[PDB]
Write a protein that binds this DNA or RNA. Structure first.
Ligand code: ADP
Ligand code: FLU
Lengths: 620, 38
DNA sequence: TTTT
């Protein structure tokens, strides 16, 4: 079950980085940190690590876009091993919560995205079928999922020449959440024509399994294209896995409704005892309806709130998560650990706050808190070997690593950027001329401001002057941010102005200067981490530069600038010694009418009506 | 997988030309994609 | 930006 890594070849200090990481695992180190400067080919080093050490491995990312971005990259890297994608199947999700300040109730609202649910089944099922598995996951991997042991157990195993009656197979299929559907054959479904059962495994939406009977004997098991009926391959064994990650059998369920009534009675005593009358009226009203529905249907909305009860498991119990579907001997790679670790930690506490106000006000039983992500202590318990990837490791990462593993040599020898510090007086003006110059070399600019105020003004200033610019409002969704970045790349804007440039996908090779206003102001935005990552955006260009405007040099500035300067020096040492040349890898009435024609254009692109999209483009 | 890999790749590239506003190229791809489905 |  080896990993088969598939166009590059370790360049720069990649070999050395890989060497240390692997050795580090071999030495059985629990925490290592790959201190990779931006643009150094971090995901490729990780890839090499994975191949040499040969464990199933979990890759955690802070946002879904990056996650998707790595997934793509790893499917290309290991075309022959199971790369999987474990994220939230919610395409929209407005949680249930209560606001006491206004006595109003947010109903849970949610649309499940079929493609993702499939990719999550693809993921958990893969961990049971083979060892050559990479999963790219969000913090979804610390949220809850049925017992891996109950799931591994509820697998229907078919093999040719097996004895088994067709209808018996059907029973088993229903007990694990499959749905007989003859007219609309989709994943999660099976269909029957005489001696042929066709199951559409929940983890596929393209291929299915055809089980041809003769009496009570499986004759052959085929893989077929579901739409067509075209045969892809015979199998002598097939594992069909549950079509859902949390199935309660009727027997478990009866006892649960019991336990929920007992909990409920206990809780009512305590509220009535404390004169929380309104809250008990509601707790009981709600819990009782939920219960009726569970006797009638073995289903109610918000059923997940009762999850711990459906496991028959004792209070305070750690959820089962993806972490649990892995072998004991597994590896975790934490991309952007400075952001991702905080995020992994903040999940339990953000979750428990929301539910406690719901429970205090009687919308949910206390047992509802047992439906939670993991505490970080619990996460920690699944740490066999863990590699942290960051140009700016966080405190957790530093504290637990013995020696960093640095990776600073970019593939095309692209250098860390030159930094100018200049004073706060003349700021806007000095900057203005640095932008004009840049517009003249068909190059782009990022400027970071501390505030909404300064960002807004300077943007209006730029526009007033006939410069093309966009203000990245913190309220901008990444989907939108990407339209804007692209536009910057293409030249529809020449400058971007914002507060946080460390927002996703801001790494663009056409950017030749990064201006940092109010650099000496420390805080979050001018910490060593921020400064560095911000400096980071100027290193995708053979000419990259950074101007920090500041009246003094702060501890943050010092460490930031110093590190940039050490790196650039080694990257030049190397470049020289290796003969490499740094190459770049690569008006109110009109405002409203353009916004509406851009929508109608984006719309026609999606419909693939590319001729209409172009009429609209040439309009704009 | 090999035929669908090509299709999935033509697909990506076609969304990509749309996003560059290279709609000309996007149509060309579209029309090509249609023929292979057929 | 992320989750139920
Ligand atoms: N060994 C290599 N040889 C050639 N090119 C590489 C190599 N490793 C990475 N690259 C490419 O060069 C660029 C820099 O890598 P990137 O993934 O941006 O690194 P990071 O994850 O540190 O930002 C990427 O587009 C990457 O695909
Ligand atoms: C795009 C997706 C869009 C919607 C969705 O539900 C899931 C998606 O997954 C992706 C995975 C990729 O590698 C690359 C792109 C995507």
């Amino acid at each position: 079950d080896r990993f088969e890594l598939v166009k590059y070849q370790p360049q720069g200090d990649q070999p050395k980085a890989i060497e240390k990481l692997v050795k580090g695992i071999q030495e059985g180190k629990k925490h290592q940190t790959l201190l990779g400067a931006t643009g150094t080919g971090k995901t490729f080093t990780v890839s090499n690590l994975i191949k040499e050490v040969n464990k199933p491995t979990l890759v955690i990312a802070h946002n879904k876009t990056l996650a998707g971005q790595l997934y793509s990259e790893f499917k290309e890297f290991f075309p022959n091993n199971a790369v999987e994608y474990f994220v939230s199947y919610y395409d929209y999700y407005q949680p249930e919560a209560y606001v006491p300040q206004t006595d109003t109730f947010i109903e849970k609202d949610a649309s499940i995205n079929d493609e993702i649910d499939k990719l999550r089944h693809s993921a958990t099922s893969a961990l049971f079928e083979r060892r050559d598995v990479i999963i790219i996951a969000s913090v979804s991997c610390i949220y809850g999922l049925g017992s891996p042991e109950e799931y591994r157990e509820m697998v229907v195993s078919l093999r040719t020449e097996m004895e088994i009656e067709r209808n018996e197979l059907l029973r088993k299929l229903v007990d694990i959440q499959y749905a007989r559907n003859d007219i609309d054959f989709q994943r999660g479904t099976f269909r029957v024509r005489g001696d042929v059962v066709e199951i559409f495994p929940a983890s596929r939406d393209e291929h299915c399994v055809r089980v041809e009977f003769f009496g009570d004997e499986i004759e052959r098991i085929r893989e077929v294209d579901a739409l067509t009926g075209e045969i892809l391959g015979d199998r002598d064994h097939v594992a069909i896995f549950p079509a859902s990650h949390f199935v309660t059998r009727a027997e478990k369920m009866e006892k649960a409704i019991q336990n929920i009534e007992k909990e409920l009675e206990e809780q009512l005593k305590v509220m009535h005892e404390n004169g929380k009358l309104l809250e008990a009226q509601r707790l009981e009203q709600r819990t009782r309806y939920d219960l009726e529905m569970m006797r009638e249907m073995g289903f109610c909305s918000g059923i997940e709130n009762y999850s711990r009860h459906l496991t028959l498991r004792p209070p305070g119990s750690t959820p089962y998560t993806l972490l649990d579907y892995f072998p004991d001997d597994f590896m975790i790679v934490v991309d952007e650990s400075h952001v991702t670790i905080p995020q992994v930690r903040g999940m339990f506490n953000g979750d428990q706050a929301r539910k406690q106000v719901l429970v205090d006000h009687g919308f949910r039983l206390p047992s509802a808190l047992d439906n939670r992500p993991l505490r970080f202590e619990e996460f920690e318990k699944h740490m066999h070997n863990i590699v942290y990837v960051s140009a700016t490791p966080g405190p957790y990462e530093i504290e637990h690593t013995d020696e960093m593993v640095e990776q600073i040599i970019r593939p095309t020898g692209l250098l860390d950027p030159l930094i100018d510090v200049r004073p706060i007086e003349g700021q806007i003006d000095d900057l203005i001329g640095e932008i004009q110059a840049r517009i003249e070399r068909n190059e782009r600019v990022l400027v970071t401001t501390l505030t909404k105020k300064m960002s807004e003004d300077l943007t209006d200033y730029l526009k007033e002057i006939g410069i093309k610019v966009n203000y990245l409002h913190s309220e901008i969704k990444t989907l939108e941010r990407i339209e804007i970045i692209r536009d910057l790349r293409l030249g529809k804007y020449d400058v971007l102005v914002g507060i946080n440039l460390l927002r996703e996908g801001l790494d663009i090779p056409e950017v030749s200067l990064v201006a940092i206003l109010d650099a000496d102001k420390e805080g979050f935005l001018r910490s060593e981490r921020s400064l560095i990552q911000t400096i980071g955006r100027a290193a995708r260009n053979a000419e990259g530069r950074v101007i920090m405007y500041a009246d003094k040099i702060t501890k943050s500035m010092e460490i930031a600038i110093n590190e940039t300067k050490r790196r650039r020096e080694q990257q030049e040492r190397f470049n020289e010694e290796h003969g490499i040349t740094p190459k770049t890898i690569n008006k109110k009435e009109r405002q409203k009418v353009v916004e509406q024609m851009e929508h109608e254009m984006k719309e026609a692109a999606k419909a693939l009506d590319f001729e209409r999209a172009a009429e609209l483009r040439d309009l704009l | 997988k090999e035929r669908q890999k090509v299709v999935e790749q033509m697909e990506h590239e076609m969304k990509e030309a749309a996003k560059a506003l290279d709609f000309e190229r996007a149509a060309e791809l579209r029309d090509l994609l249609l023929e292979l489905k057929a």
